[PDB]
């Protein structure tokens, strides 16, 4: 065939730390369906937001919002435990159906997005250009976010372990650790990946006993 219908830009959702995670690659032929399992960013999280995006940028905020919806009633559990199945389906008429289902609870929610939605031809071509021109920075952002997310999770973990050991932790230990937590929390607000990792390392360095515990 010399011609075909495609979705002209990547389609996905916003994941932890404000990054776009693609479900349907740009220029995929339609109709099409793609499903992927996601989980929860933090412990005891009972709801997620599915923010549907179109575009090629790594920063979710830089892409075109097509819609959103929440999925609630998730049983509070450890981060990473819930299995939230996210399905993007584009029919032959270019109508996009997005659903999210929590496998445990069977709770589900969905949205329908009209074919005429999103970016027009000139906006599409600018999007592609802007993505190319910003490829290095978008990659750095992506890497930054992966590190922030790791550091974020290190905070929570460490904090839960310090409470979990209570008495059995030397005060000088606890102190070193509390201070390293603060430094890390501060670094996380920054945009310097190495700085965050360095604070992770300093924290690891003073957590050895707590790690024994």
């Amino acid at each position: 065939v010399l011609l075909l219908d495609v979705t002209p830009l990547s389609l996905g959702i916003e994941t932890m730390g404000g990054v776009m995670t693609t479900l349907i690659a740009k220029n995929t032929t339609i109709p099409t369906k793609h499903s992927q399992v996601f989980s929860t960013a933090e412990d005891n999280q009972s709801a997620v937001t599915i923010h549907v995006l179109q575009g090629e940028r790594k920063r979710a905020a830089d892409n075109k919002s097509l819609g959103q919806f929440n999925l609630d009633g998730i049983n509070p559990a450890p981060r990473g435990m819930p299995q939230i199945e996210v399905t993007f389906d584009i029919d032959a008429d270019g109508i996009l159906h997005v659903s999210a289902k929590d496998k445990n609870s069977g709770k589900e929610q969905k949205i329908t997005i009209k074919a005429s939605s999103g970016l027009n031809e000139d906006e599409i071509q600018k999007m592609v250009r802007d993505a190319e021109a910003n490829a290095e920075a978008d990659r750095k952002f992506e890497e930054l976010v992966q590190t922030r997310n790791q550091g974020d999770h290190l905070l929570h973990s460490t904090r839960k372990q310090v409470e979990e050991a209570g008495d059995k932790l030397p005060a000088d230990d606890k102190t070193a650790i509390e201070s390293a937590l603060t430094a890390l929390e501060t670094a996380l607000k920054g945009e310097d990946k190495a700085a965050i990792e360095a604070k992770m390392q300093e924290l690891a360095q003073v957590s050895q006993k707590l790690m024994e515990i």
Binding site: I13, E14, T15, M16, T21, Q36, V37, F38, S39, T40, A41, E42, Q45, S46, A47, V48, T49, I50, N70, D72, R79, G80, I84, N149
Partner: peptide, 9 residues
């Protein structure tokens, strides 16, 4: 591989 989702609001 396993990506995570923010809470609402």
């Amino acid at each position: 591989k396993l990506y995570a989702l923010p809470r609402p609001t």
